[model samples]
Target: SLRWQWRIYEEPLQEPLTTAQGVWRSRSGIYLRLEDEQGQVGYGEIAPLPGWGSETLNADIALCQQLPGHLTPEIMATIPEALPAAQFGFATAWQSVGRLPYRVRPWPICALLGSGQAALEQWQQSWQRGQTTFKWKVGVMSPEEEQAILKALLAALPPGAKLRLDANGSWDRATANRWFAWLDRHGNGKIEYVEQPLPPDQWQALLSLAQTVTTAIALDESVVSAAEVQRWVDRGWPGFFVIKTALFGDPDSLSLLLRRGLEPQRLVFSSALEGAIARTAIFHLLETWQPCHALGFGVDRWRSAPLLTTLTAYERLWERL
Candidate 1:
């Protein structure tokens, strides 16, 4: 049997993250350590996003407490769908055992900007760091207010710059229509796409809305798992799929989705604010199949929690915890 251990911790974000879900000030997470008989060690983390309906921290903590001190392939295979985050954690650790270091390399990253006025300053910093494309979270305030910010954002963008608007699945049809109309009328082809303008339950509207506008709509929260991604493909979703690597199961689970006819460019590997150990694995997976869009980790653009993106960083982080 392989030995296992885990710990829970919370870290404050550099700044508050305002999404449709609410303002997030700190992130709490659980990371797992697994070692095999050969003494090869592996790492994984569960960065729960309860707002998106993943298991809560208490539930994850309980699962960690309940998990065997020694893990096995059979026990890991038993992880339930209800515990997807756990499934990801244990499975990632399992796959990582005896893994060689994925040599660090530079990859394209789309900067994730703060909301409203803060975005203007955020973009300036990101632009200087060679970020040409950016993602902004919307639908957190009044449409009119956010619209005004949109105009200011457009006015402030550098030449040849691109912007991706993320509604976080909070807009009603009427509000979505207004943004679509505004974009078609005067967006100047700079706005990349509006993401998940309508919530998941209203996907029919989302499908219809995609064809109704010049601005493409990418689905983020709507495609949480491999099955959901496959379902959207079967339904012929016309836009992009922002697959959160951390939210989706482990590397092997995600590979099943990759084996099919999914377009490489249409897939964007996203981050759910996971820490370094998970980010490293996520990149290792992406390194093999680099997507068309800027990889969504946004290490430079994200002013939130820092991502330690190396084996040394992982060990330093693990040791402190």
Candidate 2:
């Protein structure tokens, strides 16, 4: 009951998925799990912080396993619920020695672009492979270009096919205002949602824009914890929040935020694309609860297919421990 350790993996983002910004390639995710000597455990995941956070990969490894060796079972049980800043530090400590139940999902991916004939290729391929929704990358292209791509994509997709866009915080107040105005009137109903149009650091600006937009906005880089989420709610900020359980601390953090009545219709979940280990865990989450609404986690496993090395025999859905 007093030991744990961390393991590091450098898995690549499976094939064909390119970087969101420039041409930099490789899909990488970091995972952390806290284990008990008896083997019962919980898991955690950290990947892609556009602004990068308080910890780095090496620092995260150290952080996830640096828990106090004297952690009481009371604390262990509450860890997922509390996700306290110190407990997080200790989660790093204990995870360095033991194992935990938390696992990331497989096929973690961001959205695609709303434009480019290139997506027609992506759309056809994903559909042939059994995908219905396509997440488009946004904020880089203009409204006309984005809308054209979205219009083209809708025509190409099967009837009722879905679309989502991620701006990665590039749009300004005026640009988002203009683009969404056009989308509301012109883009048909192809687009399902848009995420983080304004940079989170511009917190007040985000609040103003979120309230002003007609298209639903889902938050990612913003709302890092229950506290931040509560603040957004308290201020009457409009828009969805894409909660990543691991990075936001734990399962309860989400529950707490949701309970605060932050527009049940808008909150969504986004995956940081952990490997099979994390993906399996998220399945239970997805299958167990309904997203207040459908989210952007719809693309096929193309980006992560190469990393499906092992699903672990015991971890198979058909097998029992």
Candidate 3:
């Protein structure tokens, strides 16, 4: 009923993207396209970040090439959880062919800022542009320096603005506790949460900090899958989930996993630096899942340029590809 084709794009980053793990200079991803007999086509993307503990891009592309002529429930189920990017691409393409129903909602988005006076300026600019949610990357600088920066930013925040901190699991328990205490003292309902304050393996520390910290806790690198999130929930960890859609295998399978006793309000659907196709698919998934929190999709800040400049151009390329 549906035929699939794919392409690869190695897009350069605006700057050397830094994280707790290391630095990345470019984003390499596979873009999948599915066409039906009527000439209608659907698109998807598969981009995995280094150090996030996912399969390699080469492995993902190979799996993409191995896709069957038709996508069925059984075939979707056969997709290994190890290849989440591949699974996302195939599932997105298959669902796109049928135009999976989605609701119309204005999903709020967060702007990511780094450390320095430049970052402060960006925060002011983003706030002026009506962005209420802002996220900052930590663990790159010393805790004391980061604290000073955060204090300055908090003082500069516009009314009703919220702050989200991402540590990328670079902090130790003591460091996390220090930050947590600082947040408790200074947050004033403005600090939404601190993500992955400790390493993923330090779950016990996370639980302890979550219980005592005044600011809410969120997980990014820790909760890699919906099942993993469920385990955290089952264990009574009252933290928010920052789900990178590209890392979660199939939308259907992920949806099923989420429906097994999960709350939508505690979720934040985010992108892992995908192209237009995968990002669009992620939007559809967001509509279906319906999280109240602002999404963590600030691609334009990281990407050299929008993958597809215009809808018309995307459509033309979609047809030709």
Please report, in order, the local distance difference test score of every candidate based on alpha carbons: 0.78, 0.56, 0.76
* Per-residue accuracy of model 1 over 127-241 as CA lDDT, tens digit each: 8989888999788778788888888889989898889998878889999998899888778667888989998999888999997799988998898766678888888887889
Clashes of 2: 42
lDDT string for model 2 (6-27, tens) is 4555555445544455543354
Per-candidate total of colliding backbone pairs: 0, 42, 0
Runs of candidate 2 with Cα error greater than 4 angstroms are 15-52, 69-115, 292-295, 298-321
At residue 144, candidate 2 shows an lDDT of 74
lDDT of 3 by residue, 168-272 (tens): 888888888888888777766778889889888998889888887778899888876656776788878787888888877777766775677666678888878
- Best-first order by TM-score: 3, 1, 2
TM-scores of the models, in the order given: 0.88, 0.73, 0.89
Give the candidate order by descending lDDT.
Answer: 1, 3, 2
Candidate 1 global TM-score: 0.88
- Evaluated against the true structure, the overall lDDT of model 3 is 0.76
- Give me the candidate number with maximum lDDT: 1
